[PDB]
Design an enzyme around this catalytic site. Structure first.
Site, PDB file in Angstrom:
ATOM      1  N   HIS B 351      -1.824   5.211  -8.177  1.00  0.00           N
ATOM      2  CA  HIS B 351      -2.797   5.106  -7.088  1.00  0.00           C
ATOM      3  C   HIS B 351      -2.229   5.242  -5.669  1.00  0.00           C
ATOM      4  O   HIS B 351      -2.980   5.149  -4.697  1.00  0.00           O
ATOM      5  CB  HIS B 351      -3.570   3.788  -7.192  1.00  0.00           C
ATOM      6  CG  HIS B 351      -4.327   3.627  -8.469  1.00  0.00           C
ATOM      7  ND1 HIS B 351      -5.638   4.028  -8.613  1.00  0.00           N
ATOM      8  CD2 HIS B 351      -3.961   3.097  -9.660  1.00  0.00           C
ATOM      9  CE1 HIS B 351      -6.046   3.752  -9.838  1.00  0.00           C
ATOM     10  NE2 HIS B 351      -5.046   3.189 -10.495  1.00  0.00           N
ATOM     11  N   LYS B 542     -13.287  -0.082   4.930  1.00  0.00           N
ATOM     12  CA  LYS B 542     -12.199   0.010   3.957  1.00  0.00           C
ATOM     13  C   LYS B 542     -11.194  -1.053   4.376  1.00  0.00           C
ATOM     14  O   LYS B 542     -11.255  -1.563   5.498  1.00  0.00           O
ATOM     15  CB  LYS B 542     -11.535   1.401   3.976  1.00  0.00           C
ATOM     16  CG  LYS B 542     -11.160   1.909   5.382  1.00  0.00           C
ATOM     17  CD  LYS B 542     -10.710   3.381   5.423  1.00  0.00           C
ATOM     18  CE  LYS B 542     -11.867   4.372   5.227  1.00  0.00           C
ATOM     19  NZ  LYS B 542     -11.748   5.103   3.931  1.00  0.00           N
ATOM     20  N   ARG B 543     -10.261  -1.382   3.493  1.00  0.00           N
ATOM     21  CA  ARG B 543      -9.212  -2.335   3.838  1.00  0.00           C
ATOM     22  C   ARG B 543      -8.413  -1.849   5.060  1.00  0.00           C
ATOM     23  O   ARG B 543      -8.270  -0.642   5.288  1.00  0.00           O
ATOM     24  CB  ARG B 543      -8.299  -2.588   2.628  1.00  0.00           C
ATOM     25  CG  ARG B 543      -8.974  -3.358   1.492  1.00  0.00           C
ATOM     26  CD  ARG B 543      -9.224  -4.829   1.861  1.00  0.00           C
ATOM     27  NE  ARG B 543      -7.970  -5.557   2.065  1.00  0.00           N
ATOM     28  CZ  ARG B 543      -7.400  -6.354   1.161  1.00  0.00           C
ATOM     29  NH1 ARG B 543      -7.973  -6.562  -0.019  1.00  0.00           N
ATOM     30  NH2 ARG B 543      -6.253  -6.958   1.448  1.00  0.00           N
ATOM     31  N   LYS B 548      -4.544   4.243   6.872  1.00  0.00           N
ATOM     32  CA  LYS B 548      -5.970   4.574   6.951  1.00  0.00           C
ATOM     33  C   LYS B 548      -6.407   4.850   8.394  1.00  0.00           C
ATOM     34  O   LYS B 548      -7.497   5.376   8.636  1.00  0.00           O
ATOM     35  CB  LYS B 548      -6.825   3.468   6.324  1.00  0.00           C
ATOM     36  CG  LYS B 548      -6.729   3.395   4.805  1.00  0.00           C
ATOM     37  CD  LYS B 548      -7.401   2.130   4.276  1.00  0.00           C
ATOM     38  CE  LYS B 548      -7.211   1.949   2.779  1.00  0.00           C
ATOM     39  NZ  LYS B 548      -7.988   2.960   1.995  1.00  0.00           N
ATOM     40  N   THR B 650     -12.547   6.435  -2.407  1.00  0.00           N
ATOM     41  CA  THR B 650     -13.794   6.443  -3.183  1.00  0.00           C
ATOM     42  C   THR B 650     -14.977   6.111  -2.291  1.00  0.00           C
ATOM     43  O   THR B 650     -16.103   6.532  -2.562  1.00  0.00           O
ATOM     44  CB  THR B 650     -13.774   5.469  -4.373  1.00  0.00           C
ATOM     45  OG1 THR B 650     -13.351   4.178  -3.927  1.00  0.00           O
ATOM     46  CG2 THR B 650     -12.855   5.968  -5.479  1.00  0.00           C
ATOM     47  N   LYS B 654     -19.048   7.587  -1.917  1.00  0.00           N
ATOM     48  CA  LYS B 654     -20.235   6.744  -1.713  1.00  0.00           C
ATOM     49  C   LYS B 654     -21.085   7.205  -0.516  1.00  0.00           C
ATOM     50  O   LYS B 654     -22.316   7.290  -0.618  1.00  0.00           O
ATOM     51  CB  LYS B 654     -19.833   5.270  -1.538  1.00  0.00           C
ATOM     52  CG  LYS B 654     -19.006   4.680  -2.690  1.00  0.00           C
ATOM     53  CD  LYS B 654     -18.463   3.293  -2.334  1.00  0.00           C
ATOM     54  CE  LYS B 654     -17.293   2.896  -3.242  1.00  0.00           C
ATOM     55  NZ  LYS B 654     -16.725   1.568  -2.856  1.00  0.00           N
TER      56      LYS B 654
HETATM   57  O1  LIG Z   1      -6.837  -0.055  -3.967  1.00  0.00           O
HETATM   58  C1  LIG Z   1      -5.682   0.329  -4.172  1.00  0.00           C
HETATM   59  N1  LIG Z   1      -4.649  -0.520  -4.337  1.00  0.00           N
HETATM   60  C2  LIG Z   1      -4.754  -1.861  -4.326  1.00  0.00           C
HETATM   61  O2  LIG Z   1      -5.798  -2.491  -4.150  1.00  0.00           O
HETATM   62  C3  LIG Z   1      -3.440  -2.627  -4.547  1.00  0.00           C
HETATM   63  C4  LIG Z   1      -3.449  -3.782  -5.334  1.00  0.00           C
HETATM   64  C5  LIG Z   1      -2.276  -4.502  -5.553  1.00  0.00           C
HETATM   65  C6  LIG Z   1      -1.082  -4.059  -4.974  1.00  0.00           C
HETATM   66  C7  LIG Z   1       0.100  -4.778  -5.190  1.00  0.00           C
HETATM   67  C8  LIG Z   1       1.287  -4.337  -4.604  1.00  0.00           C
HETATM   68  C9  LIG Z   1       1.302  -3.188  -3.809  1.00  0.00           C
HETATM   69  C10 LIG Z   1       0.124  -2.469  -3.593  1.00  0.00           C
HETATM   70  C11 LIG Z   1      -1.069  -2.903  -4.178  1.00  0.00           C
HETATM   71  C12 LIG Z   1      -2.249  -2.186  -3.960  1.00  0.00           C
HETATM   72  N2  LIG Z   1      -5.384   1.634  -4.223  1.00  0.00           N
HETATM   73  C13 LIG Z   1      -6.442   2.665  -4.052  1.00  0.00           C
HETATM   74  O3  LIG Z   1      -6.905   3.090  -5.368  1.00  0.00           O
HETATM   75  C14 LIG Z   1      -8.101   3.894  -5.255  1.00  0.00           C
HETATM   76  C15 LIG Z   1      -8.579   4.170  -6.690  1.00  0.00           C
HETATM   77  O4  LIG Z   1      -7.759   5.180  -7.288  1.00  0.00           O
HETATM   78  C16 LIG Z   1      -7.830   5.191  -4.451  1.00  0.00           C
HETATM   79  O5  LIG Z   1      -9.068   5.872  -4.219  1.00  0.00           O
HETATM   80  C17 LIG Z   1      -7.131   4.897  -3.105  1.00  0.00           C
HETATM   81  O6  LIG Z   1      -6.657   6.116  -2.532  1.00  0.00           O
HETATM   82  C18 LIG Z   1      -5.952   3.913  -3.298  1.00  0.00           C
HETATM   83  O7  LIG Z   1      -5.381   3.540  -2.039  1.00  0.00           O
HETATM   84  C1  LIG Z   2     -15.456   1.686  -2.464  1.00  0.00           C
HETATM   85  C2  LIG Z   2     -14.900   0.403  -1.877  1.00  0.00           C
HETATM   86  C3  LIG Z   2     -13.588   0.401  -1.372  1.00  0.00           C
HETATM   87  C4  LIG Z   2     -12.744   1.642  -1.363  1.00  0.00           C
HETATM   88  O1  LIG Z   2     -12.840   2.355  -0.109  1.00  0.00           O
HETATM   89  P1  LIG Z   2     -11.792   3.472   0.401  1.00  0.00           P
HETATM   90  O2  LIG Z   2     -12.470   3.901   1.643  1.00  0.00           O
HETATM   91  O3  LIG Z   2     -11.749   4.496  -0.660  1.00  0.00           O
HETATM   92  O4  LIG Z   2     -10.537   2.753   0.635  1.00  0.00           O
HETATM   93  C5  LIG Z   2     -13.043  -0.746  -0.807  1.00  0.00           C
HETATM   94  N1  LIG Z   2     -13.790  -1.904  -0.770  1.00  0.00           N
HETATM   95  C6  LIG Z   2     -15.076  -1.933  -1.272  1.00  0.00           C
HETATM   96  C7  LIG Z   2     -15.833  -3.226  -1.208  1.00  0.00           C
HETATM   97  C8  LIG Z   2     -15.650  -0.785  -1.833  1.00  0.00           C
HETATM   98  O5  LIG Z   2     -16.811  -0.832  -2.280  1.00  0.00           O
END
Ligand SMILES: O=C(NC(=O)c1ccc2ccccc2c1)N[C@@H]1O[C@H](CO)[C@@H](O)[C@H](O)[C@H]1O
Ligand SMILES: *Cc1c(COP(=O)(O)O)cnc(C)c1O
Ligand SMILES: O=C(NC(=O)c1ccc2ccccc2c1)N[C@@H]1O[C@H](CO)[C@@H](O)[C@H](O)[C@H]1O
Ligand SMILES: O=C(NC(=O)c1ccc2ccccc2c1)N[C@@H]1O[C@H](CO)[C@@H](O)[C@H](O)[C@H]1O
Ligand SMILES: O=C(NC(=O)c1ccc2ccccc2c1)N[C@@H]1O[C@H](CO)[C@@H](O)[C@H](O)[C@H]1O
Ligand SMILES: O=c1[nH]cnc2c1ncn2[C@@H]1O[C@H](COP(=O)(O)O)[C@@H](O)[C@H]1O
Ligand SMILES: O=c1[nH]cnc2c1ncn2[C@@H]1O[C@H](COP(=O)(O)O)[C@@H](O)[C@H]1O
Ligand SMILES: *Cc1c(COP(=O)(O)O)cnc(C)c1O
Lengths: 810, 810
Positions: B351, B542-543, B548, B650, B654
């Protein structure tokens, strides 16, 4: 099958079966193909639970409408046991559920065995609260039980190598179908902080907040459609608690530890901070509920007319200064008026005269944890001592004796003195106990305020302790005198006209034999131990304490063994001696006593010369559900505390109701039991209170008895030399040393009379007809010891409310 | 009311009403007179829940009978959101429940707002797992989601003085009606201990045991009567744990802390022991379930034919050595055969390519916690490196680059290298991301085993992300092309024949306006802030991460403000700029960015010269339920990550589905989105991956941009001098220093093109008809981004199973 269990009508049975199947599907998310016995228990539990709902809602809304005086029973312990069968009994559903489950191909008794005990108490005090709730509901009182929802109740006892091991009682693991969480009624409780004095009086500030979340359990009355509430508080951290991030969330456990575990020390007061937090937690949350309900009917003059608070021992004694705090600090009432209201509201029940059991909280703990309450206590004390000085001018020693503050190396607050000062009624739990209170430990208080001191002899509920646990006996009684005795136990007196009735004599003896057969089978199936069901079942079950003198029983057992070994070919009445009960984890001597019992068993049970003439069994994990099995099976009830030490006893009453004869000292409720049945129908032995007093003045010398009784000497030699522990010959040196040099409870002094009295028991057991006739005389006169009688006396003499057996609409 | 919400038949409505009243009475123990909105929500929840039961039991028994290949989706995160409306949608109950509640005098939308989010994830990765579960159920796959039941999910975000504050997400406080506890299926998990080598191989001994208790949540497919299971593990201490007494019971918390809280760090890998315990906990318990189910159908040759395990990132990577451990140590399979089975069973999804996010566990942690797994990892590594040496003889640097063991000050295990070695498939989450994997960070592995590397472009479920959150749009689409697109999103292409349809253009624009009105009202009612609903809704949610580039958005906002202040009487397209998202608690820069956004808002929103032409709002506590509100209301979607950094995104999908236009870089899934819609219908700007690479080779100098762009210089001067923080003039010095001297993400390099592109957005918004026509072209081509498409590709190309839209009997 049997009449007292109610009707099994076609319409009810059909309805129960379909609701059972509905819960299995919709509630448990199972189908018959993968369902286990536990699933079937839960389906039944939910089905029976449904029948409580309408009555519960309408009972509580009835109280809101009629606004009667409310009774609040505050206790740190509610020893409830199992709920399923009790609910069925009180709702007249037992036969219907039995038939319904039979038709589904299930055995209801097997399903009943799956339910965990709600073991939220140590013993007598906790079980008394449970019997009281049942009776209050049965007598139609607007009563609430308030306590703590411990995640872990009294420990499960395992015996390993003859030693007690403790394991966590994870009673909530599979869920509790009998509780309804009420998170919407969560209330804040405050700790620590400091006291600030403004123009407008004192303010308690900078506190830490713990939330109290209530869980409600229904308490059904016996067939009167009344369902009262037991509300138990659970500790919750606030959401901004400690709010690096991860640790702050994990630290929420510190707040929630308050309701984690029941303290299992029932012998010795320990000033532990967590215990103090538990005591305030229940008091602070409960009093907010009381006040809310009182306001939802400005003027606190009517408070005592609408509220009674009963303190089960000193454990919730903080209710007194907490009520004062709320009335003075929050409601802005003047001191004297708040105090008048408090005194008229509160009443206190004492459960022991043993000095080591009295709560004496270090001032430094209260100063840190509850700074405002300490200030209030000091003020209560000053005003109280001013009254004493005016009543007994110049009596300076009286002043220090009566003070709520005890001087010494560490200053302590005497919670008992606080309770007397702040209550309009103080009661003991049996006539002799209440007299001892007035003559000894509370003499000064009795002289100041004689009107406060009362007796309320304990009782047990005849629902759980006869109908539920001994349906065979309930039925043969009902055949003769009808069913009304179940809620009016005095009617058992009518059975005296059957003492010479040959059919009834045979029926009473048959029921006992069946109970003994059932219990003998239980012992083999669940514990793999064999017993002779024809032997006299000699039973002592209760918590292990020196004052209860399980050790004296041990001495008799060894005496019988030694007599058999001396004259092996002589006839003796066969006995199965059963001793059971838990020891407080830090009570070394009690743990040694358990080891001794098992050690005696190891020698006795394997001696070929003894045969099946003598068996010694330690009953593991004694608890309410086990009591319901062993008590109906007992022939002889051992109630052998040193005179003046057992405040009442309640196990004694359970055995009397269930057809056992009693060997006992004139202690606690034993005195009144013998008075009711007639001394000729009781096996009384030993020193009276007066004889104990005479022995104390002279000084108790155990050596004298050792020197003058050869049979006693032999036992001590056997203990000392390692006869009962060949590989560790000095194992029992602590026991011997205590018996010889520092026995507070005079085990040797009662030994000879005890052994002789036991011979008289064996003699009577040889005559089955005369044994049973004496049994009938006991059962027939057990009526006084119903907790319905006890509660009616509390209601009339303390709470100022009238009971009623009148039904609410179904 | 609207067609896509199903039928409201007389018989269904009558049945729902009575079951609602039954639950209120029997389940909640309330009557209408004291019931609150929360009680009404729970009554509805239980009522809808009932309809899942039969389908759930029969789906699971169907899998037992037909024994299909089972898909196990392992994730530490499942970001589910609310369940009530989703369940109604998938069961076609929405209109019926709406009518039923209306007739009882209740507003269902109000009741829906009471449900807590199941916030068991951080963002995209967790939400992807949730969308995937929905799609797998909809496509009739025998799929199970396995994770951890965190007592506390992602923290609730409060903004105080412009700063993020974190508070505990106590989501279970009022109970969770959607879970079924399964304490009977509790399994042991082992930690610590040591490895013993016997004649019969290795043995892991002297371990500490933690119990894993499953909670099952139903996952309904869209109107196909399929209900799959999400099984989440909760940590429980064994009953003899630490078994002075009191402390031992309180110490049970240490074991149970494993499932206490979700780690909220989504930026930077931290080697914390508790996190490692969580990762093994889920893996060990899950694999026992998998094996049990496989045996209940000796020969593990067929294991990969009956089992697929998908690893959501490296977080459950311990599945690989755990499977090896069970197969080798417990089942006694030879190494090579066990390894063959393991590889054919497991697949791994990456990811992110950011080095700081990769899991690199210190060897010393694994040595202490999981000694046997470390031995197995070493052995995997030796055998793998032997293969590399044979394939690339003499290439010593390749050997150290590809090693699972990283050398240095502390030895670490690279979990990504472990995952590649032990999986038959490795995928990225968007075409550009998967290409970057093969060209950069996993180049060596791709050269060794090219066949392992795949792409699976992400998707979102059109159930939650269109039908549920935007029923108005779903309905106007259904009026034209029918209802089939909901489970076959490619059908949206048919809407291209309506791009010149005047009625449809008006309807699309009307739905957007209504959504914007609804959200504008929500902001006033719940947060007391006023916005112009006629302005362009410019949204970035987004986070908060540097990559970002919320900071780039901030720069544009200040540019617009400065331009307005320079020429106040000139016309500009009014904008409401909304930025929302949570920052990881230890991510200092992200917390500073939040403070900057609010600080900009404080100046901009109170400048009288600006008026309602520009508003800057920080959307507090962004989460799934908030996303369902804001996304349908958006006009412009900000997707402005530095090219090569956002693996997919993602949120982007949406917004596209819900009628917003996108301003974005050619990063992640943005590339494929623009490809589908046509580049002319997308607002693309900035460096491509190649341009970023060229800039890195030369060296990135931010000073150059500062020197050559006067408008950029002005902003930096304003930030530095304290224009946005008058009382703390140096507050944003960290931000300025980073932008000027160590910006990994080249914010300045994209500034000019971004600002120009934003002008093109404003120009198009002035022409409502052409704006809406471009919107239609986006919605019409969004079909590829359904997670049904994504899951069908996983099924066919990785798991080796066929999807089906075929109904199970109701
Ligand atoms: O949400 C993501 N990562 C995390 O929430 C996450 C969770 C735990 C972690 C622990 C250690 C380091 C990074 C971490 C990231 N990654 C996102 O995944 C999405 C689904 O494939 C993708 O669309 C985003 O580009 C990606 O940043
Ligand atoms: C879809 C969603 C995300 C992912 O957003 P990105 O813009 O792809 O980082 C994060 N948080 C929530 C609550 C979502 O619904
Ligand atoms: O039996 C229970 N069933 C459910 O929670 C349940 C029932 C049906 C469901 C259908 C779909 C999804 C979840 C479901 C949960 N719950 C238990 O209720 C006990 C008594 O009220 C309680 O003590 C337990 O904690 C709870 O597990
Ligand atoms: O059970 C009792 N006490 C306890 O369990 C108990 C509980 C907590 C304690 C804490 C500190 C010190 C002593 C404690 C005793 N007391 C018994 O109460 C019965 C009911 O009145 C009575 O019949 C017994 O005589 C009495 O010993
Ligand atoms: O709603 C609930 N009701 C009861 O437990 C209940 C209902 C009726 C009762 C009647 C008599 C006594 C207790 C009762 C408890 N329980 C909740 O069920 C939730 C969903 O299954 C669960 O998550 C909660 O923990 C539980 O409080
Ligand atoms: O505000 C009120 N209006 C109507 N009924 C009430 C109100 N307050 C309490 N009740 C009733 O009293 C019952 C018990 O309330 P409680 O004892 O205060 O918890 C409730 O279940 C209600 O039926
Ligand atoms: O031993 C079996 N006999 C009959 N049905 C079973 C058995 N084992 C599993 N099942 C069915 O499969 C379902 C799911 O089982 P699980 O996935 O192993 O938890 C159960 O609800 C049963 O209906
Ligand atoms: C009745 C009872 C007691 C009290 O017994 P005493 O002999 O009065 O001490 C203790 N434990 C249980 C489980 C009981 O049922």
């Amino acid at each position: 099958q049997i009449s007292v269990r109610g009707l099994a009508g076609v319409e009810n049975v059909t309805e129960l079966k379909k609701n059972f199947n509905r819960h299995l599907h919709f509630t448990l998310v199972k189908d018959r193909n993968v369902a286990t016995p536990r699933d079937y228990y839960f389906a039944l539990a939910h089905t029976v639970r449904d029948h409580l709902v309408g009555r519960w809602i309408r009972t509580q809304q009835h109280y809101y409408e009629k606004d009667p005086k409310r009774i609040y029973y505050l206790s740190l312990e509610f020893y409830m046991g199992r709920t399923l069968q009790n609910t069925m009994v009180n709702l007249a559903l037992e036969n219907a559920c039995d038939e319904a489950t039979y038709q589904l191909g299930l055995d209801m008794e097997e399903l009943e065995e799956i339910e965990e005990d709600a073991g939220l108490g140590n013993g007598g005090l906790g079980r008394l609260a449970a019997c009281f709730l049942d009776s209050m509901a049965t007598l139609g009182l607007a009563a609430y039980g308030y306590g703590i929802r411990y995640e872990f109740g009294i420990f499960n006892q395992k015996i390993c190598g003859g030693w007690q091991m403790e394991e966590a009682d994870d009673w909530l693991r599979y869920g509790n179908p009998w509780e309804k969480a009420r998170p919407e009624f969560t209330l804040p409780v405050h700790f620590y902080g400091r006291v600030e004095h403004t123009s407008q009086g004192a303010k308690w500030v900078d506190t830490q907040v713990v939330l109290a979340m209530p869980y409600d359990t229904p308490v059904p009355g016996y067939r009167n459609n009344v369902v009262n509430t037991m509300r138990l508080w659970s500790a919750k951290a606030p959401n901004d608690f400690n709010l690096g991030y991860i640790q702050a969330v994990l630290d929420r456990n510190l707040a929630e530890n308050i309701s984690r575990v029941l303290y299992p020390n029932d012998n010795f007061f320990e000033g532990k901070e967590l215990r103090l937090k538990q005591e305030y937690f229940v008091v602070a949350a409960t009093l907010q509920d009381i006040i809310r309900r009182f306001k939802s009917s400005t003027n606190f003059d009517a408070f005592p007319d609408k509220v009674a608070i009963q303190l089960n021992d000193t454990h919730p004694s903080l209710a007194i200064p907490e009520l004062m705090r709320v009335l003075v600090d929050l409601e802005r009432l003047d001191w004297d008026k708040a105090w008048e209201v408090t005194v008229k509201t509160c009443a206190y029940t004492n459960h022991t005269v043993l000095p080591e059991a009295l709560e004496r909280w270090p001032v430094h703990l209260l100063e840190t944890l509850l700074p405002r309450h300490l200030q209030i206590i000091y003020e209560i004390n000053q005003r109280f001592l001013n009254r004493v000085a005016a009543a007994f001018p110049g009596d300076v020693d009286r002043l220090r004796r009566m003070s709520l503050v005890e001087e010494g190396a560490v200053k302590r607050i005497n919670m008992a003195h606080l309770c007397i000062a702040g209550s309009h009624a103080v009661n003991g739990v049996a006539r002799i106990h209440s007299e001892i209170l007035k003559k000894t430990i509370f003499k000064d208080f009795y002289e100041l305020e004689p009107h406060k001191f009362q007796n309320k002899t304990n009782g047990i509920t005849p629902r759980r302790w006869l109908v539920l646990c001994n349906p065979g006996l309930a039925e043969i009684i009902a055949e003769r005198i009808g069913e009304e005795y179940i809620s009016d136990l005095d009617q058992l007196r009518k059975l005296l006209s059957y003492v010479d009735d040959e059919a009834f004599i045979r029926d009473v003896a048959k029921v006992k034999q069946e109970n003994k057969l059932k219990f003998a089978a239980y012992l083999e199936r669940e514990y793999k131990v064999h017993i002779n069901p024809n032997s006299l079942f000699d039973v002592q079950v209760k918590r292990i304490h020196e004052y209860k003198r399980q050790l004296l029983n041990c001495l008799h057992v060894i005496t019988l063994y030694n007599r058999i070994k001396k004259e092996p070919n002589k006839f003796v009445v066969p006995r199965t001696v059963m001793i059971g009960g838990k020891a407080a984890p830090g009570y070394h001597m009690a743990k040694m006593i358990i080891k001794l019992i098992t050690a005696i068993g190891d020698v006795v049970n394997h001696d070929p010369v003894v045969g099946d003439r003598l068996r010694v069994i330690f009953l593991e994990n004694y608890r309410v559900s086990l009591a319901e099995k062993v008590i109906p099976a007992a022939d002889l009830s051992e109630q052998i505390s040193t005179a003046g030490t057992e405040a009442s006893g309640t196990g004694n009453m359970k055995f009397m109701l269930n057809g056992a004869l009693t060997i006992g000292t004139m202690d606690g409720a034993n005195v009144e039991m013998a008075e009711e049945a007639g001394e000729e129908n009781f096996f009384i032995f030993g020193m009276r209170v007066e004889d104990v007093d005479r022995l104390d003045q002279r000084g108790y010398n155990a050596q004298e008895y050792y020197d003058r009784i050869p049979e006693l000497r032999q036992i001590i030699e056997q203990l000392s030399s390692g006869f009962f522990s060949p590989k560790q010959p000095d194992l029992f040196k602590d026991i011997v040393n205590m018996l010889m040099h520092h026995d507070r409870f005079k085990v040797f002094a009662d030994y000879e009379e005890y052994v002789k009295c036991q011979e008289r028991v064996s003699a009577l057991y040889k005559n089955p007809r005369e044994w049973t006739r004496m049994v009938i005389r006991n059962i027939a006169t057990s009526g006084k010891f119903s907790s319905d009688r006890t509660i009616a006396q509390y209601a009339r003499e303390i709470w100022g409310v009238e009971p009623s057996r009148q039904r609410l609409p179904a």
